[PDB]
Design a protein around this nucleic acid. Structure first.
Lengths: 92, 100, 111, 73, 53
RNA sequence: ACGGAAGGGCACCACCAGGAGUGGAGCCUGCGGCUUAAUUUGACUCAACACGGGGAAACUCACCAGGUCCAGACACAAUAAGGAUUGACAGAUUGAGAGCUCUUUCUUGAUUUUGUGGGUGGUGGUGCAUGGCCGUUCUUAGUUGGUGGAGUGAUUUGUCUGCUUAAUUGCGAUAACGAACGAGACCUUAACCUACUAAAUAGUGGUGCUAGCAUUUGCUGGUUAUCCACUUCUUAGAGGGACUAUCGGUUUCAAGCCGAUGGAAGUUUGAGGCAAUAACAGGUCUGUGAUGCCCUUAGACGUUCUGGGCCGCACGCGCGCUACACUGACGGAGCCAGCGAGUCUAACCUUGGCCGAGAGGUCUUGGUAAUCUUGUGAAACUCCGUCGUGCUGGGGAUAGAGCAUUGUAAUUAUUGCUCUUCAACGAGGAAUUCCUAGUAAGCGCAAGUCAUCAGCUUGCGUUGAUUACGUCCCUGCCCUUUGUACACACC
């Protein structure tokens, strides 16, 4: 939860665009895959999000799947203040 | 053009039948080719401990992976190659195309 | 780019990865098995199970985000992975389905 | 926890919490007039008008180049 | 912070580890699977390795 | 269960017969003892001790002497943007920009510094929760219903009188008949598929060009498209085999054991894998992110860094290596292996030259891999010389100087090499180890950890003397008899 504003905005927009985060379990690497932020920062932010109850996590051999839920997507929508039918995360 | 269609599978019967249908289709199309050459099947051996810790007699196991490689030398245009690949299809058979 | 010797083992590892992820994340929904089919610029993966509609979910959001899962995991081309669901025939003939049913019964709490 | 006698002096040194002193940023004192701007920042293009060139004891510090700044007069 | 990993972790068993338990002993680099021996024993049937002899 | 109690049935993890180191010496390994900050661990009758693939630079060990970091979350009150960490030059520490830490400042600036029943993590601990996997059971040896019969019954027969067989596999079977599992059964590396396709990774007969011998059939080699029914050296497939064919000897002339004009052998065709209803409080809450339970969450048992540590020596124990010298040290020379191994944010495998007695790289018509290592030129043989009935020339182990490498680091020699110095060892006393095939072993290669090399482990190459059919004395197991006063059932 002690994320920088830029890092948290990047995580929020990546969740809005793709929907799911993949984080190889390597803390303090400071070079995350496809996002410049810290791997440990991403992991801790998503773990606190799960504690809040808005997103689920899977391990699958030290791999950290982060899969969004309805409550998580609605909270993200209210935080980003996006109009309806702008860019849903369940496109075909 | 001297194309080479190469199968890199593990299923022995599947490799045999896909090679058979490829060669029979070539024969019925009456086009020159080379016979299906089989590279010697390679065995990947893993010698690992039966038990996690160091209890009991020293017992090991040899896991084996048999992989079959084969290739047929053909000469066909792209559309004919695509139709050949589409016909007589079977999941798992790994095909690849090279040009010499 | 890879010799076939390492490539076959890599493909086996990828298949094991997909099977283990699906069985770990889909134990509650009654997962049974996975099969694959490779074709040019497309990879189809089919989940053999019982509750096809339930694993589909609402508007298929489950399968859409599962495809995105496999995509961002295995770093393939965007949109070249597609998954479908099929109802297994002879459902009770697989030990995995029987084990999942007994897990469900234990969760219910009968003797 | 048997071979730990803590013979070393008790040296707990939890970091200070930035004790709040009086008002800072003393530019100048002008009554009913414009207070002139001071602290001409570094001419280096790296600085983005965010480094305060405070000269306490004949030294300059820049927060942009965290590793390359060594100047003398 | 760059002071957490000053000691190199580019090579050695610190990096040559499995992807299941992140252990650095009993590892196999043959065929580039980089898996622990017992986890390999568990998952070899689905991976493709079979017991014959 | 227990027998020094009836017995039998077996095992070259035991022998009559005989080979090969261990027990006598020198060394890496693993265990117990001691010191130390630490040499922390688990494992102890075959079922501990080159075991955790655990040869220990640092990484991976948990053990230490030190300074840093939280991932501290239900919900707020207290200084609450005159405001609080992580990233900071400075008198002092420091491989450093670990302002961690004082009169003084900062890249950003609500991302809250504090407290509770929740509890995210852990090489802290229990096989007194155990999964799950292995070993031992039990290695070619044992169990279970259905219908009958005995018995009030729990139960018994079925599952053996006589017995061949490296298995209750079987003939014959007294009350049994009929089925099931283990077993038997299921299979290539161990060929000859000469029915048929199979390597610019093949052949000879001649095919274009070539060096040497008589212009006395041609010869070995070459660049690869410069050839003409093909598979004789290596892979397959609906389908091949040897079923102990066929005969002679022994069995109310019933299983089987043996000798012989032929195929790869006629001991079951070679070795192994998968694998007995049940058990061990056998190993793993201590290389596994299976996890309730007593342990932490402001100097944390998590993590990160430097230097130590499984790398220390009066000591004992087994695996493994080198020897006890015309066989071997040898040296200058001939000709040889099959499975496989090897490069994408990585430039890897020592193929021919230069810096160069060799070790790092400078060019890759060699590598997504039978062709570059590599058809694995090593492991054993033949001309020649010393140790020539040795207080040393076998023994480069037993020490110092130098010549060499990925690695932001190798000192208590990471490893190789060039010299100089044989303090041990003359079939080795009691006990024990492994072995009938082309077997132990004479000896080198491939893969694991790898940064470097194994002596460890999983796979081959030249060959072996006199049993393999024969018993308990010790290493034991099993069955049924027999005796109990036993049920976490002799502990």
């Amino acid at each position: 939860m002690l994320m920088p504003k830029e890092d948290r905005n990047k995580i929020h927009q990546y969740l809005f665009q793709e929907g799911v985060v993949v984080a190889k379990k390597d803390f303090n690497q400071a070079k995350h895959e496809e996002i410049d932020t810290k791997n440990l920062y991403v992991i801790k932010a998503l773990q606190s999000l799960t504690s809040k109850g808005y997103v689920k996590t899977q391990f699958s051999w030290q791999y950290y799947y982060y899969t969004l839920t309805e409550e998580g997507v609605e909270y993200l929508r209210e935080y980003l203040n996006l109009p309806e039918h702008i860019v849903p995360g369940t496109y075909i | 053009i001297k194309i080479r269609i190469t199968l890199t599978s593990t299923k022995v019967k599947q490799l045999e039948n896909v090679s058979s249908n490829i060669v029979k289709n070539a024969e019925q199309h009456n086009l020159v080719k080379k016979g299906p050459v089989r590279l010697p099947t390679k065995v990947l051996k893993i010698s690992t401990r039966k038990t996690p810790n160091g209890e009991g007699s020293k017992t090991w196991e040899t896991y084996e992976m048999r992989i079959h490689k084969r290739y047929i030398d053909l000469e066909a245009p792209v559309q004919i190659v695509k139709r050949i690949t589409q016909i007589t299809i079977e999941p798992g058979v790994d095909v690849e195309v090279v040009v010499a | 780019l890879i010799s076939k010797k390492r490539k076959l083992v890599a493909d086996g590892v990828f298949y094991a990865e997909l099977n283990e992820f699906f069985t770990r994340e889909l134990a509650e929904e009654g997962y049974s098995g996975v099969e694959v089919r490779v074709t040019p610029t497309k990879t189809e993966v089919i989940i053999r199970a019982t509750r096809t509609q339930d694993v589909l979910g609402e508007n298929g959001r489950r399968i859409n985000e599962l495809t995105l899962l496999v995509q961002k995991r295995f770093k393939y081309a965007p949109g070249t992975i597609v998954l479908y669901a099929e109802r297994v025939q002879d459902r009770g003939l697989s030990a995995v389905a029987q084990a999942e049913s007994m897990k469900f019964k234990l969760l219910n709490g009968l003797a | 926890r048997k071979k730990k006698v803590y013979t070393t002096p008790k040296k707990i040194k939890h970091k200070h919490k930035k004790v709040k002193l009086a008002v800072l940023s003393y530019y100048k004192v002008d009554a009913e007039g414009k207070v002139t701007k001071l602290r001409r920042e570094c001419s280096n293009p790296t600085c983005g008008a965010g480094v305060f060139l405070a000269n306490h004891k004949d030294r300059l510090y820049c927060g942009k180049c965290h590793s390359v700044y060594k100047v003398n007069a | 912070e760059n002071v957490w990993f000053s000691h190199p972790r580019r090579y050695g068993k610190g990096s040559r580890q499995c992807r299941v338990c992140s252990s650095h002993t009993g590892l196999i680099r043959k065929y580039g699977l980089n898996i622990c021996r017992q986890c390999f024993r568990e998952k070899a049937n689905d991976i493709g390795f079979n017991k014959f002899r």
